[PDB]
Design a protein around this ligand. Sequence first.
Ligand SMILES: [Mg+2]
Length: 503
Amino acid sequence: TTTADGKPIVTVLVKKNANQEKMANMQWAKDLEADCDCKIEWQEVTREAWAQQKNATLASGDIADVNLNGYGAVEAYQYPGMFEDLSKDLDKLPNVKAFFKQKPDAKKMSTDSKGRIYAIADGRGKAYSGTGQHMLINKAWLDKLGLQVPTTWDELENVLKAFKTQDPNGNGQADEIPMNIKKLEGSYFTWYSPMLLLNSTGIVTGFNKGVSEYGFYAKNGVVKSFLTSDEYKEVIKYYHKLISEGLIPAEWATKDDDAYNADQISDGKTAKTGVVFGWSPSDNFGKLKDQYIAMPVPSAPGVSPDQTVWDGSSSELSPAGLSISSHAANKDAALKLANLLYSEKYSVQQFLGSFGKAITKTGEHEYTVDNDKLSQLTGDNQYPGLSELLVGWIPDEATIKGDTHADELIEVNKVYEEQRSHFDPVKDYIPDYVNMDNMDPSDATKLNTNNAEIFNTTMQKTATWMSKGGIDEEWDAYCKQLDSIGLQESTKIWQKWYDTYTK
Ligand SMILES: [Mg+2]
Protein backbone atom coordinates (compact mmCIF):
# COMPACT_ATOMS: atom_id res chain seq x y z
CA THR A 1 0.00 0.00 0.00
CA THR A 2 3.13 2.19 -0.03
CA THR A 3 5.78 3.20 -2.62
CA ALA A 4 9.57 2.79 -2.37
CA ASP A 5 9.82 6.49 -1.37
CA GLY A 6 7.14 5.78 1.24
CA LYS A 7 4.29 7.59 -0.56
CA PRO A 8 0.82 6.12 0.06
CA ILE A 9 -0.83 4.27 -2.84
CA VAL A 10 -4.44 5.17 -3.56
CA THR A 11 -6.73 3.08 -5.79
CA VAL A 12 -9.34 5.18 -7.56
CA LEU A 13 -12.18 3.82 -9.63
CA VAL A 14 -13.33 6.38 -12.27
CA LYS A 15 -16.23 6.13 -14.71
CA LYS A 16 -15.40 7.46 -18.21
CA ASN A 17 -17.13 8.31 -21.49
CA ALA A 18 -15.69 6.32 -24.45
CA ASN A 19 -14.57 9.57 -26.13
CA GLN A 20 -12.16 10.40 -23.30
CA GLU A 21 -8.39 10.16 -23.17
CA LYS A 22 -6.87 7.68 -20.66
CA MET A 23 -6.17 9.03 -17.13
CA ALA A 24 -2.49 8.25 -17.63
CA ASN A 25 -2.34 10.87 -20.48
CA MET A 26 -4.01 13.68 -18.53
CA GLN A 27 -1.56 16.20 -17.11
CA TRP A 28 -4.00 17.38 -14.40
CA ALA A 29 -4.19 13.79 -13.09
CA LYS A 30 -0.39 13.79 -12.67
CA ASP A 31 -0.48 17.25 -11.04
CA LEU A 32 -3.15 15.96 -8.69
CA GLU A 33 -0.97 12.95 -7.77
CA ALA A 34 2.01 15.28 -7.04
CA ASP A 35 -0.15 17.69 -4.96
CA CYS A 36 -1.42 14.73 -2.93
CA ASP A 37 2.12 13.30 -2.54
CA CYS A 38 0.77 9.83 -3.24
CA LYS A 39 0.66 7.32 -6.08
CA ILE A 40 -2.70 6.94 -7.79
CA GLU A 41 -3.64 3.58 -9.38
CA TRP A 42 -6.53 4.45 -11.75
CA GLN A 43 -9.19 1.92 -12.52
CA GLU A 44 -11.02 3.29 -15.56
CA VAL A 45 -14.45 1.96 -16.47
CA THR A 46 -16.87 3.11 -19.19
CA ARG A 47 -20.58 3.73 -18.48
CA GLU A 48 -21.55 0.43 -20.10
CA ALA A 49 -18.68 -1.73 -18.80
CA TRP A 50 -19.33 -0.61 -15.22
CA ALA A 51 -23.04 -1.52 -15.39
CA GLN A 52 -21.95 -5.16 -15.77
CA GLN A 53 -18.98 -4.99 -13.41
CA LYS A 54 -20.67 -3.07 -10.52
CA ASN A 55 -22.79 -5.57 -8.52
CA ALA A 56 -20.05 -8.13 -9.04
CA THR A 57 -17.69 -5.68 -7.22
CA LEU A 58 -20.03 -5.05 -4.30
CA ALA A 59 -20.67 -8.82 -3.94
CA SER A 60 -16.88 -9.17 -4.17
CA GLY A 61 -16.50 -6.93 -1.09
CA ASP A 62 -13.40 -5.37 -2.68
CA ILE A 63 -13.83 -1.76 -3.74
CA ALA A 64 -11.36 0.97 -4.74
CA ASP A 65 -10.21 3.41 -2.03
CA VAL A 66 -11.76 6.37 -3.86
CA ASN A 67 -14.67 5.93 -6.25
CA LEU A 68 -15.76 8.46 -8.85
CA ASN A 69 -19.33 8.01 -10.09
CA GLY A 70 -19.14 4.38 -8.99
CA TYR A 71 -21.79 4.07 -6.30
CA GLY A 72 -24.76 5.77 -4.73
CA ALA A 73 -25.38 6.16 -1.00
CA VAL A 74 -28.09 3.47 -0.75
CA GLU A 75 -25.32 0.94 -1.43
CA ALA A 76 -23.62 1.90 1.81
CA TYR A 77 -26.84 0.65 3.45
CA GLN A 78 -27.11 -2.45 1.26
CA TYR A 79 -23.51 -3.40 2.13
CA PRO A 80 -22.97 -2.24 5.74
CA GLY A 81 -19.47 -1.02 6.65
CA MET A 82 -18.21 -0.87 3.07
CA PHE A 83 -18.31 2.92 2.69
CA GLU A 84 -16.88 5.70 4.82
CA ASP A 85 -19.36 8.06 6.47
CA LEU A 86 -17.78 11.28 5.23
CA SER A 87 -19.90 13.42 7.56
CA LYS A 88 -17.41 12.48 10.30
CA ASP A 89 -14.48 13.76 8.14
CA LEU A 90 -15.61 17.25 6.94
CA ASP A 91 -12.63 18.98 8.59
CA LYS A 92 -10.42 17.08 6.14
CA LEU A 93 -12.73 18.22 3.31
CA PRO A 94 -12.72 22.05 3.40
CA ASN A 95 -13.42 22.24 -0.39
CA VAL A 96 -16.51 20.07 0.09
CA LYS A 97 -17.66 22.28 2.99
CA ALA A 98 -17.24 25.27 0.64
CA PHE A 99 -19.34 23.50 -2.00
CA PHE A 100 -22.10 22.79 0.55
CA LYS A 101 -22.07 26.40 1.73
CA GLN A 102 -22.54 27.93 -1.74
CA LYS A 103 -24.88 25.19 -3.07
CA PRO A 104 -27.16 24.04 -0.25
CA ASP A 105 -28.97 21.69 -2.64
CA ALA A 106 -25.68 19.73 -3.04
CA LYS A 107 -25.48 19.36 0.74
CA LYS A 108 -28.99 17.98 0.72
CA MET A 109 -28.20 15.64 -2.19
CA SER A 110 -25.12 14.45 -0.30
CA THR A 111 -26.74 13.93 3.12
CA ASP A 112 -29.36 11.32 3.94
CA SER A 113 -32.12 11.56 6.51
CA LYS A 114 -29.85 9.93 9.11
CA GLY A 115 -27.37 12.79 8.51
CA ARG A 116 -24.77 10.48 6.97
CA ILE A 117 -22.72 11.35 3.87
CA TYR A 118 -21.85 8.29 1.84
CA ALA A 119 -21.76 9.83 -1.62
CA ILE A 120 -20.90 13.45 -2.33
CA ALA A 121 -22.58 15.24 -5.21
CA ASP A 122 -20.78 17.20 -7.92
CA GLY A 123 -21.53 20.41 -9.84
CA ARG A 124 -20.80 21.63 -13.37
CA GLY A 125 -21.18 25.34 -12.61
CA LYS A 126 -23.93 27.95 -12.52
CA ALA A 127 -23.86 28.17 -16.32
CA TYR A 128 -25.67 24.80 -16.19
CA SER A 129 -28.15 25.77 -13.47
CA GLY A 130 -31.19 25.80 -15.83
CA THR A 131 -33.08 22.88 -17.38
CA GLY A 132 -31.71 20.70 -20.15
CA GLN A 133 -35.20 20.40 -21.70
CA HIS A 134 -36.32 22.89 -24.35
CA MET A 135 -38.83 23.12 -27.18
CA LEU A 136 -37.28 24.27 -30.46
CA ILE A 137 -39.03 25.71 -33.50
CA ASN A 138 -38.01 26.69 -37.01
CA LYS A 139 -38.37 30.48 -36.77
CA ALA A 140 -37.37 31.01 -40.46
CA TRP A 141 -40.32 28.81 -41.45
CA LEU A 142 -42.64 30.87 -39.26
CA ASP A 143 -41.31 34.11 -40.84
CA LYS A 144 -41.51 32.72 -44.38
CA LEU A 145 -45.14 31.67 -43.84
CA GLY A 146 -46.10 34.88 -41.99
CA LEU A 147 -46.97 33.07 -38.72
CA GLN A 148 -46.27 33.74 -35.04
CA VAL A 149 -44.81 31.46 -32.36
CA PRO A 150 -47.91 29.56 -31.11
CA THR A 151 -49.03 30.02 -27.53
CA THR A 152 -51.86 27.48 -27.37
CA TRP A 153 -52.32 23.85 -28.46
CA ASP A 154 -54.75 25.03 -31.17
CA GLU A 155 -52.28 27.63 -32.51
CA LEU A 156 -49.55 24.95 -32.48
CA GLU A 157 -51.71 22.55 -34.47
CA ASN A 158 -52.41 25.33 -37.03
CA VAL A 159 -48.68 26.12 -37.30
CA LEU A 160 -47.89 22.41 -37.85
CA LYS A 161 -50.54 22.07 -40.59
CA ALA A 162 -48.91 25.07 -42.32
CA PHE A 163 -45.45 23.41 -42.03
CA LYS A 164 -47.01 20.25 -43.48
CA THR A 165 -48.69 21.77 -46.55
CA GLN A 166 -47.02 25.10 -47.45
CA ASP A 167 -43.51 23.86 -48.30
CA PRO A 168 -41.61 26.28 -45.96
CA ASN A 169 -38.17 24.88 -46.94
CA GLY A 170 -39.01 25.91 -50.54
CA ASN A 171 -37.86 22.72 -52.33
CA GLY A 172 -41.29 21.85 -53.74
CA GLN A 173 -41.30 18.53 -51.88
CA ALA A 174 -43.77 17.61 -49.14
CA ASP A 175 -40.76 16.54 -47.09
CA GLU A 176 -41.31 18.73 -43.98
CA ILE A 177 -41.79 16.79 -40.71
CA PRO A 178 -43.92 19.36 -38.87
CA MET A 179 -43.06 18.06 -35.40
CA ASN A 180 -40.75 15.18 -34.52
CA ILE A 181 -40.86 13.25 -31.25
CA LYS A 182 -38.71 10.55 -29.60
CA LYS A 183 -39.93 6.99 -29.12
CA LEU A 184 -40.89 6.07 -25.56
CA GLU A 185 -38.48 4.00 -23.44
CA GLY A 186 -39.97 1.03 -21.57
CA SER A 187 -38.94 1.93 -18.01
CA TYR A 188 -38.70 5.78 -17.73
CA PHE A 189 -39.52 9.11 -19.41
CA THR A 190 -36.42 10.24 -21.33
CA TRP A 191 -34.64 13.49 -22.03
CA TYR A 192 -36.66 15.38 -24.59
CA SER A 193 -39.69 13.14 -23.94
CA PRO A 194 -42.88 13.98 -25.83
CA MET A 195 -44.41 14.11 -22.30
CA LEU A 196 -42.77 17.53 -21.90
CA LEU A 197 -46.16 18.71 -23.16
CA LEU A 198 -47.38 17.97 -19.62
CA ASN A 199 -45.97 21.42 -18.76
CA SER A 200 -48.73 22.90 -21.02
CA THR A 201 -51.31 21.49 -18.64
CA GLY A 202 -49.76 23.00 -15.52
CA ILE A 203 -47.81 19.92 -14.34
CA VAL A 204 -44.06 20.62 -13.83
CA THR A 205 -41.76 17.94 -15.29
CA GLY A 206 -38.15 17.19 -14.25
CA PHE A 207 -36.79 14.93 -16.94
CA ASN A 208 -33.02 15.61 -16.52
CA LYS A 209 -32.92 13.05 -13.67
CA GLY A 210 -34.87 11.75 -10.68
CA VAL A 211 -38.44 11.09 -9.73
CA SER A 212 -40.42 12.63 -12.61
CA GLU A 213 -38.89 10.18 -15.07
CA TYR A 214 -41.00 7.53 -13.27
CA GLY A 215 -44.13 9.64 -13.67
CA PHE A 216 -44.36 11.48 -10.35
CA TYR A 217 -44.91 15.18 -9.71
CA ALA A 218 -46.00 17.57 -6.95
CA LYS A 219 -48.44 20.44 -6.66
CA ASN A 220 -49.26 22.41 -3.50
CA GLY A 221 -47.10 20.03 -1.49
CA VAL A 222 -48.91 16.83 -2.58
CA VAL A 223 -47.16 14.12 -4.60
CA LYS A 224 -49.15 12.55 -7.45
CA SER A 225 -48.53 10.31 -10.41
CA PHE A 226 -49.25 11.89 -13.76
CA LEU A 227 -49.73 8.34 -15.21
CA THR A 228 -53.34 8.38 -14.03
CA SER A 229 -53.99 12.17 -14.44
CA ASP A 230 -56.56 13.73 -16.77
CA GLU A 231 -53.62 15.85 -17.91
CA TYR A 232 -51.67 12.82 -19.14
CA LYS A 233 -54.83 11.67 -20.97
CA GLU A 234 -55.23 15.14 -22.60
CA VAL A 235 -51.58 15.14 -23.73
CA ILE A 236 -52.03 11.69 -25.35
CA LYS A 237 -55.25 12.68 -27.14
CA TYR A 238 -53.54 15.84 -28.45
CA TYR A 239 -50.64 13.79 -29.80
CA HIS A 240 -53.12 11.37 -31.39
CA LYS A 241 -54.83 14.25 -33.14
CA LEU A 242 -51.42 15.44 -34.45
CA ILE A 243 -50.19 11.97 -35.51
CA SER A 244 -53.55 11.16 -37.09
CA GLU A 245 -53.26 14.36 -39.16
CA GLY A 246 -49.81 13.42 -40.49
CA LEU A 247 -48.12 16.11 -38.39
CA ILE A 248 -45.70 13.71 -36.59
CA PRO A 249 -44.21 10.70 -38.38
CA ALA A 250 -46.37 7.58 -38.43
CA GLU A 251 -43.35 5.47 -37.43
CA TRP A 252 -42.22 7.69 -34.48
CA ALA A 253 -42.81 4.96 -31.86
CA THR A 254 -40.29 2.52 -33.29
CA LYS A 255 -37.67 4.90 -34.65
CA ASP A 256 -34.22 4.49 -33.13
CA ASP A 257 -32.59 7.54 -31.49
CA ASP A 258 -29.92 7.79 -34.23
CA ALA A 259 -32.48 7.90 -37.08
CA TYR A 260 -34.58 10.36 -35.13
CA ASN A 261 -31.65 12.78 -34.66
CA ALA A 262 -30.61 12.37 -38.31
CA ASP A 263 -34.12 13.57 -39.29
CA GLN A 264 -33.38 17.00 -37.75
CA ILE A 265 -29.78 17.27 -38.96
CA SER A 266 -30.80 16.33 -42.53
CA ASP A 267 -28.00 17.15 -45.00
CA GLY A 268 -26.98 20.42 -43.28
CA LYS A 269 -28.45 22.36 -46.23
CA THR A 270 -32.24 21.82 -46.20
CA ALA A 271 -34.11 21.90 -42.90
CA LYS A 272 -36.65 19.09 -42.53
CA THR A 273 -38.19 19.44 -39.06
CA GLY A 274 -40.38 22.24 -37.71
CA VAL A 275 -40.57 21.48 -33.96
CA VAL A 276 -38.65 19.18 -31.57
CA PHE A 277 -37.73 18.96 -27.90
CA GLY A 278 -33.99 19.21 -27.44
CA TRP A 279 -30.93 20.91 -25.99
CA SER A 280 -30.31 23.80 -28.41
CA PRO A 281 -30.58 24.86 -32.07
CA SER A 282 -26.90 24.09 -32.48
CA ASP A 283 -26.96 20.71 -30.73
CA ASN A 284 -30.06 19.50 -32.52
CA PHE A 285 -29.75 21.16 -35.95
CA GLY A 286 -25.99 21.76 -36.42
CA LYS A 287 -25.33 23.82 -39.57
CA LEU A 288 -29.06 24.69 -39.81
CA LYS A 289 -29.05 26.31 -36.33
CA ASP A 290 -29.75 29.93 -37.41
CA GLN A 291 -33.25 28.94 -38.56
CA TYR A 292 -34.20 27.75 -35.06
CA ILE A 293 -35.08 29.29 -31.67
CA ALA A 294 -36.33 28.00 -28.33
CA MET A 295 -40.02 28.85 -27.67
CA PRO A 296 -42.06 28.94 -24.45
CA VAL A 297 -44.38 25.94 -24.24
CA PRO A 298 -47.99 26.55 -25.61
CA SER A 299 -50.79 26.40 -23.03
CA ALA A 300 -53.31 23.53 -22.99
CA PRO A 301 -57.02 24.40 -23.18
CA GLY A 302 -58.25 25.90 -19.90
CA VAL A 303 -54.71 26.63 -18.76
CA SER A 304 -53.80 30.30 -18.39
CA PRO A 305 -50.35 31.63 -19.41
CA ASP A 306 -49.78 32.29 -15.64
CA GLN A 307 -50.58 28.63 -14.88
CA THR A 308 -48.41 27.27 -17.71
CA VAL A 309 -45.08 25.92 -16.46
CA TRP A 310 -41.83 24.55 -17.89
CA ASP A 311 -39.52 21.69 -16.87
CA GLY A 312 -37.99 22.30 -13.43
CA SER A 313 -34.69 20.40 -13.84
CA SER A 314 -31.23 21.79 -13.19
CA SER A 315 -28.25 20.59 -15.24
CA GLU A 316 -25.68 21.71 -12.63
CA LEU A 317 -25.75 19.27 -9.72
CA SER A 318 -25.56 15.51 -9.91
CA PRO A 319 -25.79 13.07 -7.01
CA ALA A 320 -23.36 10.30 -6.08
CA GLY A 321 -20.04 11.52 -7.43
CA LEU A 322 -17.59 10.65 -4.64
CA SER A 323 -17.49 7.66 -2.27
CA ILE A 324 -14.62 6.35 -0.15
CA SER A 325 -13.98 2.80 0.99
CA SER A 326 -14.22 2.41 4.76
CA HIS A 327 -11.36 -0.13 4.26
CA ALA A 328 -9.08 2.36 2.46
CA ALA A 329 -5.46 1.30 3.10
CA ASN A 330 -4.39 4.93 3.49
CA LYS A 331 -7.54 6.78 4.70
CA ASP A 332 -5.94 10.23 5.22
CA ALA A 333 -4.42 10.14 1.71
CA ALA A 334 -7.85 9.14 0.32
CA LEU A 335 -9.43 12.18 2.02
CA LYS A 336 -6.64 14.43 0.83
CA LEU A 337 -7.19 13.25 -2.74
CA ALA A 338 -10.95 13.80 -2.45
CA ASN A 339 -10.51 17.29 -1.05
CA LEU A 340 -8.19 18.21 -3.93
CA LEU A 341 -10.78 16.94 -6.48
CA TYR A 342 -13.19 19.53 -5.09
CA SER A 343 -10.74 22.44 -5.45
CA GLU A 344 -11.31 24.87 -8.30
CA LYS A 345 -8.00 23.94 -9.92
CA TYR A 346 -8.87 20.29 -10.25
CA SER A 347 -12.61 20.73 -10.76
CA VAL A 348 -12.13 22.96 -13.80
CA GLN A 349 -9.45 20.65 -15.25
CA GLN A 350 -11.60 17.57 -14.75
CA PHE A 351 -14.36 19.42 -16.59
CA LEU A 352 -12.48 20.95 -19.51
CA GLY A 353 -9.05 19.24 -19.53
CA SER A 354 -5.54 20.19 -18.44
CA PHE A 355 -4.41 23.85 -18.48
CA GLY A 356 -2.48 24.61 -21.67
CA LYS A 357 -4.26 21.82 -23.60
CA ALA A 358 -7.74 23.02 -24.65
CA ILE A 359 -8.28 25.50 -21.81
CA THR A 360 -6.09 28.33 -20.51
CA LYS A 361 -6.21 29.99 -17.07
CA THR A 362 -6.25 33.74 -17.79
CA GLY A 363 -6.81 34.84 -14.17
CA GLU A 364 -7.29 33.57 -10.61
CA HIS A 365 -10.86 32.47 -11.42
CA GLU A 366 -10.93 32.93 -15.20
CA TYR A 367 -10.53 30.48 -18.03
CA THR A 368 -10.81 30.48 -21.81
CA VAL A 369 -11.66 27.36 -23.79
CA ASP A 370 -10.17 26.85 -27.24
CA ASN A 371 -13.09 25.31 -29.10
CA ASP A 372 -11.40 24.14 -32.27
CA LYS A 373 -9.07 22.19 -30.04
CA LEU A 374 -11.75 20.71 -27.80
CA SER A 375 -13.79 19.56 -30.84
CA GLN A 376 -10.71 18.04 -32.47
CA LEU A 377 -9.79 16.16 -29.27
CA THR A 378 -13.42 14.93 -28.88
CA GLY A 379 -13.56 13.78 -32.49
CA ASP A 380 -10.31 11.81 -31.94
CA ASN A 381 -11.75 10.14 -28.78
CA GLN A 382 -9.22 12.15 -26.78
CA TYR A 383 -11.39 14.42 -24.66
CA PRO A 384 -8.83 15.75 -22.12
CA GLY A 385 -11.02 15.44 -19.02
CA LEU A 386 -14.07 13.85 -17.42
CA SER A 387 -16.53 16.47 -18.73
CA GLU A 388 -19.98 15.89 -17.22
CA LEU A 389 -18.50 12.96 -15.17
CA LEU A 390 -16.37 15.35 -13.12
CA VAL A 391 -16.40 14.75 -9.40
CA GLY A 392 -15.77 18.16 -7.88
CA TRP A 393 -17.58 21.47 -8.24
CA ILE A 394 -17.26 24.60 -10.37
CA PRO A 395 -17.67 27.54 -7.97
CA ASP A 396 -19.84 30.58 -8.82
CA GLU A 397 -16.79 32.83 -8.72
CA ALA A 398 -15.37 30.98 -11.78
CA THR A 399 -15.91 32.54 -15.22
CA ILE A 400 -15.33 30.20 -18.18
CA LYS A 401 -15.24 31.70 -21.71
CA GLY A 402 -15.90 29.49 -24.78
CA ASP A 403 -17.81 26.51 -23.30
CA THR A 404 -20.20 26.47 -26.29
CA HIS A 405 -22.34 23.75 -24.67
CA ALA A 406 -22.89 26.18 -21.72
CA ASP A 407 -23.28 29.34 -23.84
CA GLU A 408 -26.06 27.75 -25.96
CA LEU A 409 -27.74 26.54 -22.77
CA ILE A 410 -27.69 30.03 -21.23
CA GLU A 411 -29.31 31.54 -24.34
CA VAL A 412 -32.19 28.99 -24.62
CA ASN A 413 -32.79 29.08 -20.86
CA LYS A 414 -33.62 32.80 -21.05
CA VAL A 415 -36.69 31.81 -23.00
CA TYR A 416 -38.04 29.71 -20.08
CA GLU A 417 -37.50 32.07 -17.15
CA GLU A 418 -41.07 33.36 -17.25
CA GLN A 419 -42.76 29.88 -17.34
CA ARG A 420 -40.32 28.49 -14.78
CA SER A 421 -41.24 31.35 -12.43
CA HIS A 422 -44.83 30.02 -12.50
CA PHE A 423 -44.21 27.19 -10.03
CA ASP A 424 -42.87 26.87 -6.44
CA PRO A 425 -39.58 24.91 -6.72
CA VAL A 426 -40.42 23.12 -3.46
CA LYS A 427 -44.25 22.86 -3.33
CA ASP A 428 -44.72 22.19 -7.08
CA TYR A 429 -41.56 20.21 -7.88
CA ILE A 430 -40.10 17.22 -6.06
CA PRO A 431 -36.54 18.42 -5.49
CA ASP A 432 -33.53 16.62 -6.94
CA TYR A 433 -32.26 15.60 -3.51
CA VAL A 434 -35.39 13.46 -3.10
CA ASN A 435 -34.36 10.36 -5.02
CA MET A 436 -34.15 6.60 -4.66
CA ASP A 437 -30.51 6.83 -3.77
CA ASN A 438 -31.38 8.93 -0.67
CA MET A 439 -33.95 6.46 0.79
CA ASP A 440 -33.87 3.33 2.98
CA PRO A 441 -32.93 0.25 0.88
CA SER A 442 -36.28 -1.35 1.76
CA ASP A 443 -38.13 1.64 0.29
CA ALA A 444 -35.95 1.74 -2.84
CA THR A 445 -36.67 -2.02 -3.27
CA LYS A 446 -40.45 -1.43 -3.11
CA LEU A 447 -40.20 1.37 -5.62
CA ASN A 448 -38.12 -0.76 -8.04
CA THR A 449 -40.43 -3.75 -7.69
CA ASN A 450 -43.46 -1.51 -8.33
CA ASN A 451 -41.71 0.20 -11.22
CA ALA A 452 -41.27 -3.13 -13.00
CA GLU A 453 -45.04 -3.72 -12.76
CA ILE A 454 -46.00 -0.08 -13.55
CA PHE A 455 -43.74 0.07 -16.58
CA ASN A 456 -44.68 -3.47 -17.76
CA THR A 457 -47.24 -2.11 -20.31
CA THR A 458 -47.64 1.65 -19.59
CA MET A 459 -45.26 2.99 -22.29
CA GLN A 460 -46.52 0.43 -24.80
CA LYS A 461 -50.15 1.41 -24.12
CA THR A 462 -49.23 5.12 -24.15
CA ALA A 463 -47.57 4.78 -27.59
CA THR A 464 -50.52 2.77 -28.96
CA TRP A 465 -53.03 5.39 -27.79
CA MET A 466 -50.91 8.13 -29.35
CA SER A 467 -50.71 6.31 -32.69
CA LYS A 468 -54.08 4.46 -32.86
CA GLY A 469 -56.44 6.27 -30.45
CA GLY A 470 -58.88 4.45 -28.18
CA ILE A 471 -57.81 6.03 -24.89
CA ASP A 472 -61.28 7.27 -23.80
CA GLU A 473 -62.73 3.75 -23.68
CA GLU A 474 -59.66 2.12 -22.06
CA TRP A 475 -58.60 4.83 -19.59
CA ASP A 476 -60.60 3.77 -16.47
CA ALA A 477 -59.52 0.13 -16.59
CA TYR A 478 -55.93 1.20 -17.24
CA CYS A 479 -55.92 3.48 -14.16
CA LYS A 480 -57.49 0.90 -11.83
CA GLN A 481 -54.96 -1.66 -13.07
CA LEU A 482 -52.02 0.66 -12.25
CA ASP A 483 -53.47 1.31 -8.77
CA SER A 484 -53.98 -2.42 -8.25
CA ILE A 485 -50.31 -3.22 -8.85
CA GLY A 486 -48.83 -0.64 -6.49
CA LEU A 487 -48.94 2.85 -8.05
CA GLN A 488 -50.66 4.37 -5.01
CA GLU A 489 -48.10 2.71 -2.77
CA SER A 490 -45.29 4.30 -4.77
CA THR A 491 -47.00 7.69 -4.61
CA LYS A 492 -47.27 7.34 -0.81
CA ILE A 493 -43.62 6.35 -0.49
CA TRP A 494 -42.47 9.35 -2.56
CA GLN A 495 -44.75 11.60 -0.45
CA LYS A 496 -43.03 10.34 2.69
CA TRP A 497 -39.51 11.01 1.42
CA TYR A 498 -40.58 14.35 -0.07
CA ASP A 499 -41.96 15.39 3.37
CA THR A 500 -38.89 14.06 5.19
CA TYR A 501 -36.51 16.19 3.09
CA THR A 502 -38.80 19.16 2.54
CA LYS A 503 -41.33 19.57 5.43
MG1 LIG B 1 -40.38 21.01 -48.76
